[PDB]
Tab-separated table of C-alpha atoms in Angstrom:
chain	number	residue	atom	x	y	z
A	1	UNK	CA	26.111	-12.335	12.414
A	2	UNK	CA	26.795	-13.446	8.741
A	3	UNK	CA	23.581	-15.111	8.774
A	4	UNK	CA	20.525	-13.820	7.343
A	5	UNK	CA	18.997	-16.704	5.943
A	6	UNK	CA	15.014	-15.342	6.881
A	7	UNK	CA	11.688	-13.598	7.364
A	8	UNK	CA	12.520	-10.698	8.686
A	9	UNK	CA	9.078	-7.704	10.003
A	10	UNK	CA	10.277	-4.096	9.899
A	11	UNK	CA	10.172	-3.321	13.846
A	12	UNK	CA	11.179	0.762	13.580
A	13	UNK	CA	12.636	3.092	11.057
A	14	UNK	CA	14.576	6.463	11.363
A	15	UNK	CA	15.115	9.852	9.192
A	16	UNK	CA	13.424	8.445	6.244
A	17	UNK	CA	12.132	11.432	4.572
A	18	UNK	CA	15.110	12.764	4.583
A	19	UNK	CA	16.671	9.973	2.963
A	20	UNK	CA	14.167	10.113	-0.185
A	21	UNK	CA	14.439	13.849	-0.341
A	22	UNK	CA	18.603	13.393	-0.936
A	23	UNK	CA	17.713	10.696	-3.886
A	24	UNK	CA	15.491	13.265	-5.483
A	25	UNK	CA	12.360	12.054	-4.478
A	26	UNK	CA	8.879	13.687	-3.813
A	27	UNK	CA	6.449	14.415	-1.562
A	28	UNK	CA	2.962	12.310	-1.965
A	29	UNK	CA	5.735	9.440	-2.491
A	30	UNK	CA	8.133	10.376	0.476
A	31	UNK	CA	4.009	10.725	2.925
A	32	UNK	CA	3.209	7.180	1.482
A	33	UNK	CA	6.601	5.317	2.456
A	34	UNK	CA	6.054	6.810	6.160
A	35	UNK	CA	2.818	5.361	6.497
A	36	UNK	CA	4.549	1.794	5.259
A	37	UNK	CA	6.110	-1.571	6.781
A	38	UNK	CA	8.676	-3.481	5.209
A	39	UNK	CA	9.315	-7.000	5.353
A	40	UNK	CA	12.712	-8.720	3.805
A	41	UNK	CA	12.667	-12.720	2.684
A	42	UNK	CA	16.154	-13.417	2.087
A	43	UNK	CA	17.517	-16.720	1.064
A	44	UNK	CA	21.282	-17.054	1.371
A	45	UNK	CA	23.359	-19.788	0.271
A	46	UNK	CA	26.598	-18.500	0.773
A	47	UNK	CA	27.996	-16.103	-1.142
A	48	UNK	CA	24.131	-16.088	-2.999
A	49	UNK	CA	21.460	-13.593	-1.684
A	50	UNK	CA	17.742	-13.772	-2.778
A	51	UNK	CA	15.658	-10.656	-1.562
A	52	UNK	CA	12.278	-10.085	-1.255
A	53	UNK	CA	10.641	-6.142	0.396
A	54	UNK	CA	7.261	-6.907	1.492
A	55	UNK	CA	5.297	-3.913	1.610
A	56	UNK	CA	1.582	-3.460	4.240
A	57	UNK	CA	0.838	0.031	5.632
A	58	UNK	CA	2.085	0.751	9.278
A	59	UNK	CA	0.225	-0.408	12.021
A	60	UNK	CA	-0.511	1.853	14.634
A	61	UNK	CA	-0.672	0.555	18.421
A	62	UNK	CA	-2.245	2.780	21.387
A	63	UNK	CA	-1.839	1.458	25.096
A	64	UNK	CA	-3.663	2.842	28.323
A	65	UNK	CA	-4.904	2.420	31.209
A	66	UNK	CA	-8.732	3.852	32.158
A	67	UNK	CA	-7.996	6.657	34.870
A	68	UNK	CA	-4.348	7.166	34.361
A	69	UNK	CA	-3.136	10.050	31.943
A	70	UNK	CA	-1.579	8.962	28.933
A	71	UNK	CA	0.597	10.581	26.619
A	72	UNK	CA	-0.688	9.655	23.506
A	73	UNK	CA	1.454	10.403	20.397
A	74	UNK	CA	-1.346	11.144	17.202
A	75	UNK	CA	0.801	9.215	13.852
A	76	UNK	CA	-1.059	7.978	10.873
A	77	UNK	CA	-2.939	11.347	11.117
A	78	UNK	CA	-1.826	14.418	13.226
A	79	UNK	CA	1.715	14.013	13.869
A	80	UNK	CA	1.150	15.853	16.961
A	81	UNK	CA	1.665	14.540	20.799
A	82	UNK	CA	-1.299	15.309	22.861
A	83	UNK	CA	-2.366	13.748	26.993
A	84	UNK	CA	-4.947	10.892	26.752
A	85	UNK	CA	-7.326	10.299	29.960
A	86	UNK	CA	-9.517	7.210	29.333
A	87	UNK	CA	-12.417	6.599	32.028
A	88	UNK	CA	-15.711	4.255	32.026
A	89	UNK	CA	-18.775	6.321	31.681
A	90	UNK	CA	-21.240	3.251	32.080
A	91	UNK	CA	-19.718	1.180	29.191
A	92	UNK	CA	-19.375	3.998	27.268
A	93	UNK	CA	-15.417	4.609	26.870
A	94	UNK	CA	-14.699	8.482	27.071
A	95	UNK	CA	-11.903	10.452	25.738
A	96	UNK	CA	-9.751	13.044	26.456
A	97	UNK	CA	-7.105	14.837	23.872
A	98	UNK	CA	-5.429	17.646	25.532
A	99	UNK	CA	-2.836	18.596	23.441
A	100	UNK	CA	-2.817	21.347	20.437
A	101	UNK	CA	-6.324	21.316	19.397
A	102	UNK	CA	-8.579	22.196	21.773
A	103	UNK	CA	-11.849	20.169	21.881
A	104	UNK	CA	-9.643	16.893	20.998
A	105	UNK	CA	-11.135	14.018	22.984
A	106	UNK	CA	-13.292	11.059	22.235
A	107	UNK	CA	-16.831	8.402	22.681
A	108	UNK	CA	-16.540	5.164	22.574
A	109	UNK	CA	-19.455	2.947	23.683
A	110	UNK	CA	-20.418	-0.716	22.664
A	111	UNK	CA	-24.263	-0.974	22.224
A	112	UNK	CA	-25.251	-4.795	21.160
A	113	UNK	CA	-22.971	-6.788	19.084
A	114	UNK	CA	-21.329	-3.408	17.514
A	115	UNK	CA	-19.216	-0.936	18.809
A	116	UNK	CA	-19.742	2.510	17.611
A	117	UNK	CA	-16.912	5.152	18.189
A	118	UNK	CA	-17.218	9.107	17.984
A	119	UNK	CA	-14.640	11.223	17.267
A	120	UNK	CA	-14.371	15.006	17.816
A	121	UNK	CA	-11.913	17.314	17.229
A	122	UNK	CA	-13.083	20.831	17.542
A	123	UNK	CA	-15.498	21.804	15.197
A	124	UNK	CA	-15.925	18.281	13.500
A	125	UNK	CA	-16.541	15.220	14.798
A	126	UNK	CA	-16.819	11.917	13.145
A	127	UNK	CA	-18.794	8.802	13.760
A	128	UNK	CA	-17.471	5.560	13.517
A	129	UNK	CA	-18.726	2.386	13.364
A	130	UNK	CA	-17.317	-0.967	12.959
A	131	UNK	CA	-18.474	-4.501	12.335
A	132	UNK	CA	-17.213	-7.931	14.257
A	133	UNK	CA	-15.356	-10.169	12.920
B	1	UNK	CA	-12.790	-19.310	-24.763
B	2	UNK	CA	-15.387	-16.645	-22.344
B	3	UNK	CA	-14.422	-17.813	-19.137
B	4	UNK	CA	-12.616	-15.353	-17.599
B	5	UNK	CA	-13.929	-17.381	-14.112
B	6	UNK	CA	-10.445	-17.104	-11.789
B	7	UNK	CA	-8.498	-15.456	-9.519
B	8	UNK	CA	-6.425	-13.657	-11.781
B	9	UNK	CA	-2.559	-11.578	-10.287
B	10	UNK	CA	-1.197	-9.194	-12.170
B	11	UNK	CA	2.110	-9.742	-13.545
B	12	UNK	CA	2.197	-6.178	-15.815
B	13	UNK	CA	1.045	-2.871	-16.719
B	14	UNK	CA	1.852	-0.376	-19.290
B	15	UNK	CA	0.628	3.486	-20.131
B	16	UNK	CA	-1.018	3.740	-16.789
B	17	UNK	CA	0.504	7.137	-16.058
B	18	UNK	CA	-0.069	8.016	-19.138
B	19	UNK	CA	-3.894	6.880	-18.669
B	20	UNK	CA	-4.487	8.688	-15.755
B	21	UNK	CA	-3.325	11.858	-17.316
B	22	UNK	CA	-5.898	11.617	-20.239
B	23	UNK	CA	-8.748	11.192	-16.810
B	24	UNK	CA	-8.023	13.637	-15.588
B	25	UNK	CA	-5.706	12.873	-12.533
B	26	UNK	CA	-3.638	14.691	-10.453
B	27	UNK	CA	0.757	13.756	-9.448
B	28	UNK	CA	-0.087	12.881	-6.026
B	29	UNK	CA	-3.041	9.835	-6.388
B	30	UNK	CA	-0.905	8.889	-10.103
B	31	UNK	CA	1.839	8.603	-7.149
B	32	UNK	CA	0.035	6.141	-5.820
B	33	UNK	CA	-1.481	4.162	-7.903
B	34	UNK	CA	1.919	3.547	-9.921
B	35	UNK	CA	3.001	2.084	-6.320
B	36	UNK	CA	0.369	-0.983	-6.802
B	37	UNK	CA	-0.305	-4.439	-7.559
B	38	UNK	CA	-4.114	-5.142	-8.326
B	39	UNK	CA	-5.172	-9.062	-7.985
B	40	UNK	CA	-9.115	-10.075	-9.670
B	41	UNK	CA	-11.595	-12.350	-8.868
B	42	UNK	CA	-13.874	-13.208	-11.539
B	43	UNK	CA	-17.248	-14.571	-10.651
B	44	UNK	CA	-19.050	-16.057	-14.129
B	45	UNK	CA	-23.165	-17.057	-13.356
B	46	UNK	CA	-23.665	-16.873	-16.809
B	47	UNK	CA	-24.276	-13.459	-18.281
B	48	UNK	CA	-23.404	-11.835	-14.866
B	49	UNK	CA	-20.139	-11.095	-13.766
B	50	UNK	CA	-18.890	-10.291	-9.946
B	51	UNK	CA	-15.126	-9.180	-10.340
B	52	UNK	CA	-13.116	-8.092	-6.865
B	53	UNK	CA	-10.171	-5.443	-7.046
B	54	UNK	CA	-7.428	-6.255	-4.035
B	55	UNK	CA	-5.123	-4.114	-4.108
B	56	UNK	CA	-1.447	-4.308	-2.233
B	57	UNK	CA	2.076	-3.027	-2.731
B	58	UNK	CA	4.085	-4.053	-5.504
B	59	UNK	CA	6.875	-6.488	-3.370
B	60	UNK	CA	10.496	-5.810	-4.998
B	61	UNK	CA	12.830	-8.505	-5.314
B	62	UNK	CA	16.502	-8.690	-5.309
B	63	UNK	CA	19.240	-11.128	-6.039
B	64	UNK	CA	23.506	-10.022	-6.575
B	65	UNK	CA	26.734	-12.719	-4.878
B	66	UNK	CA	28.949	-10.653	-3.090
B	67	UNK	CA	31.980	-9.390	-4.726
B	68	UNK	CA	30.537	-9.498	-8.245
B	69	UNK	CA	29.704	-6.380	-9.262
B	70	UNK	CA	25.863	-5.549	-10.542
B	71	UNK	CA	23.372	-3.260	-12.291
B	72	UNK	CA	20.269	-2.120	-9.482
B	73	UNK	CA	17.952	-0.323	-11.268
B	74	UNK	CA	16.316	1.219	-7.534
B	75	UNK	CA	11.972	0.424	-9.280
B	76	UNK	CA	11.409	0.499	-4.766
B	77	UNK	CA	12.959	4.312	-4.189
B	78	UNK	CA	14.239	6.726	-7.421
B	79	UNK	CA	13.836	4.416	-10.343
B	80	UNK	CA	18.243	5.096	-10.633
B	81	UNK	CA	20.123	2.632	-12.608
B	82	UNK	CA	23.354	1.978	-10.149
B	83	UNK	CA	26.671	-0.185	-10.174
B	84	UNK	CA	26.162	-2.044	-7.074
B	85	UNK	CA	29.416	-4.115	-5.393
B	86	UNK	CA	28.629	-6.409	-2.160
B	87	UNK	CA	31.729	-6.611	-0.092
B	88	UNK	CA	32.297	-8.289	3.056
B	89	UNK	CA	34.087	-5.937	6.291
B	90	UNK	CA	34.053	-8.567	9.382
B	91	UNK	CA	30.591	-9.981	9.712
B	92	UNK	CA	29.065	-6.398	8.337
B	93	UNK	CA	27.121	-6.793	4.331
B	94	UNK	CA	28.256	-3.368	2.648
B	95	UNK	CA	28.008	-2.097	-0.710
B	96	UNK	CA	28.988	0.514	-3.149
B	97	UNK	CA	25.988	1.991	-5.454
B	98	UNK	CA	28.139	4.242	-8.031
B	99	UNK	CA	25.905	6.626	-9.630
B	100	UNK	CA	24.841	9.997	-10.274
B	101	UNK	CA	24.427	10.147	-6.099
B	102	UNK	CA	28.664	10.404	-3.880
B	103	UNK	CA	27.949	8.154	-1.598
B	104	UNK	CA	25.574	5.916	-1.812
B	105	UNK	CA	25.238	2.421	-0.224
B	106	UNK	CA	23.898	0.324	2.748
B	107	UNK	CA	25.376	-1.433	5.899
B	108	UNK	CA	23.632	-4.539	6.802
B	109	UNK	CA	24.018	-6.840	9.983
B	110	UNK	CA	22.935	-9.149	11.881
B	111	UNK	CA	23.077	-8.993	15.797
B	112	UNK	CA	20.659	-11.745	17.799
B	113	UNK	CA	17.521	-11.826	16.883
B	114	UNK	CA	17.578	-8.664	14.477
B	115	UNK	CA	18.356	-6.755	11.254
B	116	UNK	CA	20.014	-3.376	11.087
B	117	UNK	CA	20.024	-2.157	7.936
B	118	UNK	CA	22.021	1.807	7.775
B	119	UNK	CA	21.181	3.351	4.019
B	120	UNK	CA	23.368	6.576	3.681
B	121	UNK	CA	23.792	8.882	-0.090
B	122	UNK	CA	25.529	11.440	0.876
B	123	UNK	CA	24.990	13.446	4.241
B	124	UNK	CA	21.688	11.644	4.547
B	125	UNK	CA	21.094	8.312	6.740
B	126	UNK	CA	18.606	5.606	6.989
B	127	UNK	CA	17.866	3.519	9.906
B	128	UNK	CA	16.086	0.532	9.673
B	129	UNK	CA	15.548	-2.326	12.683
B	130	UNK	CA	13.782	-5.579	11.325
B	131	UNK	CA	12.956	-8.209	13.633
B	132	UNK	CA	13.558	-11.880	12.837
B	133	UNK	CA	9.761	-14.390	12.396
C	1	UNK	CA	-20.114	-5.009	31.149
C	2	UNK	CA	-16.953	-4.977	29.017
C	3	UNK	CA	-14.811	-6.638	27.751
C	4	UNK	CA	-15.071	-5.258	24.280
C	5	UNK	CA	-11.625	-7.384	23.530
C	6	UNK	CA	-12.381	-8.274	20.144
C	7	UNK	CA	-11.102	-8.012	15.968
C	8	UNK	CA	-13.721	-5.390	14.597
C	9	UNK	CA	-13.774	-4.969	10.720
C	10	UNK	CA	-14.405	-0.883	9.094
C	11	UNK	CA	-18.150	-0.639	7.765
C	12	UNK	CA	-19.353	2.817	7.875
C	13	UNK	CA	-17.711	5.790	9.981
C	14	UNK	CA	-19.480	9.428	8.973
C	15	UNK	CA	-16.933	12.635	8.025
C	16	UNK	CA	-13.961	11.578	7.173
C	17	UNK	CA	-12.653	14.338	5.468
C	18	UNK	CA	-13.901	17.023	7.240
C	19	UNK	CA	-12.368	15.804	10.145
C	20	UNK	CA	-9.139	14.978	8.989
C	21	UNK	CA	-8.444	18.662	7.064
C	22	UNK	CA	-9.059	20.039	10.622
C	23	UNK	CA	-6.314	17.918	11.780
C	24	UNK	CA	-3.999	20.163	9.633
C	25	UNK	CA	-2.836	17.532	7.228
C	26	UNK	CA	-3.944	17.356	4.029
C	27	UNK	CA	-3.263	17.230	0.085
C	28	UNK	CA	-1.232	13.657	-0.741
C	29	UNK	CA	-1.860	12.542	3.076
C	30	UNK	CA	-5.710	13.197	2.056
C	31	UNK	CA	-6.334	11.561	-1.059
C	32	UNK	CA	-4.071	8.159	0.410
C	33	UNK	CA	-6.615	8.285	3.698
C	34	UNK	CA	-10.052	7.943	1.902
C	35	UNK	CA	-9.119	4.374	0.104
C	36	UNK	CA	-8.571	2.319	3.512
C	37	UNK	CA	-10.458	0.695	5.746
C	38	UNK	CA	-8.960	0.200	9.582
C	39	UNK	CA	-9.313	-3.055	11.942
C	40	UNK	CA	-8.506	-2.713	15.501
C	41	UNK	CA	-7.365	-5.631	17.101
C	42	UNK	CA	-8.281	-5.074	21.506
C	43	UNK	CA	-6.211	-7.022	23.894
C	44	UNK	CA	-8.172	-6.176	27.662
C	45	UNK	CA	-6.884	-6.976	30.700
C	46	UNK	CA	-8.971	-4.835	33.311
C	47	UNK	CA	-8.448	-1.954	33.609
C	48	UNK	CA	-4.879	-2.839	30.601
C	49	UNK	CA	-5.549	-2.510	26.390
C	50	UNK	CA	-3.356	-2.754	24.483
C	51	UNK	CA	-4.715	-2.058	20.702
C	52	UNK	CA	-3.409	-2.379	17.113
C	53	UNK	CA	-4.923	-0.510	14.493
C	54	UNK	CA	-3.684	-2.471	11.081
C	55	UNK	CA	-5.264	-0.778	8.097
C	56	UNK	CA	-5.403	-1.878	4.195
C	57	UNK	CA	-7.158	-1.112	1.001
C	58	UNK	CA	-10.706	-0.585	1.059
C	59	UNK	CA	-10.834	-2.690	-2.435
C	60	UNK	CA	-13.461	-2.203	-5.053
C	61	UNK	CA	-16.522	-4.239	-6.293
C	62	UNK	CA	-18.139	-4.469	-10.102
C	63	UNK	CA	-21.406	-6.155	-10.203
C	64	UNK	CA	-23.397	-6.549	-14.002
C	65	UNK	CA	-24.740	-8.837	-16.972
C	66	UNK	CA	-23.167	-8.322	-20.048
C	67	UNK	CA	-25.904	-6.739	-22.082
C	68	UNK	CA	-27.982	-4.927	-19.560
C	69	UNK	CA	-26.599	-1.205	-19.729
C	70	UNK	CA	-25.489	0.055	-16.042
C	71	UNK	CA	-24.782	2.966	-13.970
C	72	UNK	CA	-20.632	2.979	-13.582
C	73	UNK	CA	-19.766	5.042	-10.551
C	74	UNK	CA	-15.780	4.808	-11.756
C	75	UNK	CA	-14.014	5.066	-8.239
C	76	UNK	CA	-10.599	4.668	-7.603
C	77	UNK	CA	-9.438	6.525	-10.556
C	78	UNK	CA	-11.414	10.151	-11.560
C	79	UNK	CA	-14.652	9.494	-9.406
C	80	UNK	CA	-17.456	9.751	-12.844
C	81	UNK	CA	-20.293	8.454	-13.497
C	82	UNK	CA	-20.679	6.504	-17.145
C	83	UNK	CA	-23.829	4.294	-18.769
C	84	UNK	CA	-21.557	1.623	-18.594
C	85	UNK	CA	-22.514	-1.245	-21.666
C	86	UNK	CA	-20.709	-4.391	-21.581
C	87	UNK	CA	-20.901	-7.132	-24.228
C	88	UNK	CA	-18.823	-9.559	-26.623
C	89	UNK	CA	-17.726	-9.097	-29.587
C	90	UNK	CA	-16.163	-12.921	-30.546
C	91	UNK	CA	-14.033	-13.525	-27.381
C	92	UNK	CA	-13.289	-10.187	-26.705
C	93	UNK	CA	-15.448	-8.655	-23.441
C	94	UNK	CA	-15.936	-5.323	-24.353
C	95	UNK	CA	-17.035	-2.729	-22.286
C	96	UNK	CA	-18.378	1.233	-23.637
C	97	UNK	CA	-18.459	3.889	-20.901
C	98	UNK	CA	-20.486	6.355	-22.172
C	99	UNK	CA	-19.737	10.179	-20.040
C	100	UNK	CA	-17.965	13.428	-19.578
C	101	UNK	CA	-14.802	11.458	-21.469
C	102	UNK	CA	-14.945	10.444	-25.458
C	103	UNK	CA	-13.961	6.805	-26.099
C	104	UNK	CA	-13.517	5.393	-22.384
C	105	UNK	CA	-14.560	1.999	-22.038
C	106	UNK	CA	-12.447	-1.589	-21.784
C	107	UNK	CA	-11.557	-4.771	-23.623
C	108	UNK	CA	-10.737	-8.142	-21.536
C	109	UNK	CA	-10.139	-11.348	-23.626
C	110	UNK	CA	-8.109	-14.553	-22.263
C	111	UNK	CA	-4.781	-15.855	-23.496
C	112	UNK	CA	-3.518	-19.205	-22.381
C	113	UNK	CA	-3.755	-19.338	-18.629
C	114	UNK	CA	-3.136	-15.491	-19.384
C	115	UNK	CA	-6.166	-12.564	-19.180
C	116	UNK	CA	-4.984	-9.267	-21.238
C	117	UNK	CA	-6.867	-6.256	-19.961
C	118	UNK	CA	-6.975	-2.992	-22.020
C	119	UNK	CA	-7.585	0.699	-20.912
C	120	UNK	CA	-8.705	2.886	-23.207
C	121	UNK	CA	-9.467	6.717	-22.859
C	122	UNK	CA	-9.552	9.090	-25.454
C	123	UNK	CA	-5.454	8.924	-27.071
C	124	UNK	CA	-4.052	7.144	-23.975
C	125	UNK	CA	-4.429	2.856	-24.191
C	126	UNK	CA	-2.730	0.744	-20.920
C	127	UNK	CA	-2.438	-3.017	-21.269
C	128	UNK	CA	-1.834	-4.908	-18.218
C	129	UNK	CA	-1.673	-9.061	-18.049
C	130	UNK	CA	-3.302	-10.837	-14.952
C	131	UNK	CA	-1.956	-14.485	-14.454
C	132	UNK	CA	-4.193	-17.335	-13.152
C	133	UNK	CA	-3.627	-18.135	-9.311
């Protein structure tokens, strides 16, 4: 309970924009920091502390089952809650995002050794291609 | 010498926001770059140069001893000078940050494999949880 | 058919600024997202998906030959096109960037185990020091 010697990786975070706003800090810097995850390296020898804070952007996670409508909180983009439904269309993974936005969803399909992802939102359509590593 | 071939890690950086202000660049975009550290990989083949610039977030280091009041310059928050005093209250590491802000401090305690950090400034409290790795 | 379980690195993608503006988000956050590349780790077990998207900076690469004037599109700063010519002045690597800004260039020289970089634009000069690793 008193031994902080360790590399610590951040897993959550609460009222942080309010803490930065209370510290007299502006939009941008607040808008960056909300997208970062910190890592604390603490070297403690008795009463002596050495702390290092490393930042590396807020990883984003999504979990779903094909055919099971689930709640997708679309952070790192537009902090909205959307009901997502993933289905198989051949080998193309098609998704509908029921929420505040109309015509919100995406389509993803594998062609050979590459993954193609088409993002649809209203009138704007985003096509994305990924490379295997 | 003319041999710049090497991985170079940035150690300083002066008048850089002013350099961006002269380049016609605005607040926000400047507020990102001031929080970045670059690493240059220089590959020299005769008179041919190959440079790669990798950008990560700046790590911050703090060293203190509980019971010894020290001056903490909050470079990782809102560039302020505070006289900080860290004391043990049971097994909870409590800190008071005497400065321009009232009720400014933090508390840290280890509970199992997780680190809990509460940041207090006036009426705003920021909760952060870290996991051991 | 159907086993995309694998680490994917972003290589192309299409219209992203229009998609981000349509998602009700902009200003600071818009200026950052255009400079990031994501990598997706997909863990698929039958009909169960676990996806994690970790992001980093897109990084900038430059290739040139000393004495050969080339067209430099100055991204990661203020998106301008400058005619750049890099020449040796003793042991100082000097570059002139002919363009919209006057007296715009940089100089680079090795001093011991450190790399020194002075960035000049008009009246503002940015000093940067790198250490070899």
